[PDB]
Design a protein around this ligand. Structure first.
Ligand code: AGS
Ligand code: AGS
Ligand code: AGS
Lengths: 579, 189, 63
């Protein structure tokens, strides 16, 4: 018999306990049954996103049959799953494979209980654009005989059948709904014993609850049935792995940890032992960025809320960093990526200044279908999609055309930035930092180091006169950087000199420096210029120290361990001399 | 139900789609096949009334304001669009009255969204912190949204820190310490 | 047959020392292995930059 070669007896497998018990979906199973109980064209098809559970419904059909929950009409029935192999076992000798298929149909109608045939991946029924499709299920469907049940996704359905036409007439579409978190948890509980058996572990009820809710928060591209199960099963596996690696229970923290391993979201690592680093994040950031403590605190707070789980699930952190050039707005953001990932290059830098009106959105989201280039995603889908815990940086947001900022409004609230092709990114787990110079006209008021009142308000004025209120309203915090005072400059000099040593890839580029008060003072006085923030220090060091070093190196006046000497200016010591 | 967040940013071609949507919504897809969505709900938004409602002259939209707002709407969208909308509503501004009710709601919302609420809010707001949040967070010209910022700034940041330091084991003490009071949540354990 | 015709026995190549040793990547190896240890849908996939060591990870699995 062809069914013994080309199909799986779902009802046998149900009888044998090989299929998961179905949880919930009572209306969908009833709907399926009502359609199968029809006299004419009794052919339902389960439609819905992949990861929904529509196969589970089919398993449910088999279970209902085994236990006769099925109406009298359908109780005397069997359910088989037709493999593609009936046709895909080879078409050598044109028509043979169609004959095998018809053969199957003959067996199905012929007497032996109400055999219903399940068609997985129904898109395959499309054949070669009709043509080779022949009569796939033609007279069958036209007579209410040879009843079939199938399943496929919206994405597939949208083409396949809608393109075919005939199949729409023949099949009855039924949508399968994605379960709520409540329902999702119920599913997990129903499958709990399967998993406990699968891995030899107990599952904490709280853990089951956690996976369902957690999955909704951190696995946006995969529907809840799957996502929750992925977290539960992977957690259970983790315990089993640990058992072999050399506790046989999954708890909520097992899940959170593993979810972080799969999602990249550090929040769920529950790294309680590392809270000290997070708590002192302020301190650590201050070791690079001098002063600007309010900005530093603003960041630390955003990060801490995220790590605690308190940060609102739909609200990306959002900041506007305002100040004169050289104030560390960019530097702080980079340092934050440094802290968070131990890698400043983790950051998704967006040159948002390069965003004139007509292009900006295609650089960030990419274009829709049709237009040249489909690497949709430009910068943001292509990066946010893979690094949801990342930090976005929009340098000089004031220059971005308001049109793109309009797009940023989605990003900045609910994270619903969508691709050019209509896919939702869901980047609410990220941190968004934007910078600008709008307040320069008031920071240049020179009203103190810590920016004084009035100056801050005038800056706010400039911001309000530049960005639309709706934009500003979506900003978690607007931060104005402080003027870099002499004391800040002294601290900065210490830091910049250290960086110079960090840039020294080889030990022929090395300072002892000396003049830790003299040079420090020299540099501090010369770089103490409001008009450039900390930046001229970079120029001072280069012009007074490094340019000269370069020459000393070329002249072999240095081997290692360099010294800076005071000139009434600065210069370098000659250690060897043209050696 | 559909939501058009700033439908006003649409170009006439989209607005044309919406004209069909809003009246004989047999919208033709690029594929060439229609949709027929007359059974859907279409909610669209716009910021056009900001220029008048920000006068703050009455929280319930006044007749002068209403007309000025609708003026902008009619300048922006062709009337053909507007004539197909079941209703155009200008939202009322958040009177301080509203703000007190909202603060309670928001605080409960925070509790509701707090995953597994080991730590949970006691919300010992007392009338004083209720007024603090309601009063100092009432940046009338930005609606209720600033209330959230205030809560994050004053409550949640401190809470998160106390959580990280394990100074809180469960629950969540609240009080007002003394806008300069900054509310300030107490220790726990 | 079949698998012996259309596939490379990575395991044996590793046994034979024909594959590079894999250095570190323990967290990625553990994650891959953990997925393979799943009961249902035990099918990990290594997603990333063009050339960062995805082959190296699979060779690590063989080893
Ligand atoms: N309501 C449910 N009752 C029992 N098991 C379920 C339920 N929902 C999901 N599952 C389990 O998780 C899976 C649900 O996914 P499936 O329906 O098999 O995949 P799908 O929905 O067909 O997506 P495709 O299109 O087949 S990838 C099933 O294989 C079951 O193991
Ligand atoms: N507060 C600070 N502490 C230490 N270094 C700083 C500080 N502020 C600025 N810098 C230096 O400034 C340089 C980078 O310039 P930035 O200050 O980021 O300019 P920016 O204004 O932040 O970015 P813009 O807006 O394009 S200048 C780095 O070399 C930093 O070391
Ligand atoms: N941790 C590692 N240990 C040993 N070799 C490594 C490691 N990481 C990368 N490699 C090297 O990576 C090279 C092969 O790279 P692949 O992993 O194939 O690159 P890839 O990630 O496969 O990129 P594609 O997809 O093939 S372009 C080998 O020659 C390895 O030596």
């Amino acid at each position: 018999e062809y069914l013994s070669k080309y199909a799986i007896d779902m009802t046998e497998q149900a009888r044998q306990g090989k299929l998961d018990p179905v949880i919930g979906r009572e209306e969908e199973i009833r709907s399926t049954i009502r359609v199968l109980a029809r006299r004419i064209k009794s052919n339902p098809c389960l439609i819905g996103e992949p990861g929904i559970g529509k196969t589970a419904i089919i398993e449910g059909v088999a279970q209902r049959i085994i236990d006769d929950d099925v109406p009298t009409i359908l109780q005397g029935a069997k359910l088989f799953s037709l493999d593609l192999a009936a046709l895909t076992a080879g078409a050598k000798y044109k028509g043979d494979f169609e004959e095998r298929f018809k053969g199957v149909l003959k067996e199905i109608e012929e007497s032996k209980t109400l055999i219903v045939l399940f068609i997985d991946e129904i898109h395959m029924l499309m054949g070669n654009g009709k043509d080779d499709a022949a009569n796939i299920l033609k007279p069958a469907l036209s007579r209410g005989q040879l009843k079939v049940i199938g399943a496929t996704t919206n994405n597939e359905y949208r083409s396949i059948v809608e393109k075919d036409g005939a199949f729409e007439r023949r099949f009855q579409k039924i949508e399968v709904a994605e379960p709520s978190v409540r329902q999702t948890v119920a599913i997990l509980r129903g499958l709990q014993p399967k998993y406990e058996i699968h891995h030899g572990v107990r599952i904490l009820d709280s853990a089951l609850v956690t996976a369902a809710q957690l999955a909704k928060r951190y696995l946006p591209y995969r529907r809840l049935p799957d996502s929750a199960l992925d977290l539960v099963d992977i957690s259970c596996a983790g315990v089993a792995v640990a058992r072999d690696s050399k506790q046989n229970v999954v708890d909520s923290d097992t899940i959170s940890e593993t979810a972080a391993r799969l999602t990249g979201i550090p929040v769920k690592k529950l790294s309680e032992s590392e809270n000290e680093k997070l708590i002192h994040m302020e301190r650590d950031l201050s070791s690079e960025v001098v002063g600007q403590m309010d900005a530093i605190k603003a960041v630390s707070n955003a990060v801490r809320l995220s790590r605690s789980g308190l940060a609102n699930p739909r609200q990306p952190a959002s900041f506007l960093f305002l100040g004169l050039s050289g104030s560390g707005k960019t530097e702080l953001a980079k340092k934050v990526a440094g802290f968070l990932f131990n890698d400043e290059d983790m950051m998704i830098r967006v040159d948002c200044s390069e965003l004139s009106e007509k292009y900006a959105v295609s650089k960030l989201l990419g274009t829709t279908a049709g237009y040249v280039g489909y690497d949709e995603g430009g910068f943001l889908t292509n990066q946010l999609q893979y690094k949801p815990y990342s930090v976005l940086l929009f340098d000089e947001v004031e220059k971005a055309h308001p049109d793109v900022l309009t797009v940023m409004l989605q990003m900045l609230d609910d994270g619903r930035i969508t691709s050019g092709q209509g896919k939702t990114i869901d980047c609410s787990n990220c941190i968004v930092i934007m910078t600008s110079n709008l307040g320069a006209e008031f920071i240049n008021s020179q009203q103190g180091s810590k920016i004084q009142e009035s100056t801050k308000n005038l800056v706010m004025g400039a911001v309000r006169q530049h960005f639309r209120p709706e934009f500003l309203n979506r900003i978690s915090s607007i931060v104005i950087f402080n003027k870099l005072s002499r004391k800040a400059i002294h601290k900065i000099v210490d830091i910049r000199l250290k960086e110079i040593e960090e840039r020294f890839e080889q030990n022929d580029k090395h300072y002892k420096l000396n003049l830790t008060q003299e040079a420090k003072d020299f540099l501090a006085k010369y770089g103490y210029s409001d008009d450039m923030g900390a930046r001229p220090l970079n120029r001072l060091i280069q012009n007074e120290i490094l340019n000269k070093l370069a020459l000393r190196i070329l002249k072999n006046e240095i081997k290692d361990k360099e010294t800076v000497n005071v000139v009434l200016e600065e210069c370098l010591e000659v250690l060897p001399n043209h050696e």
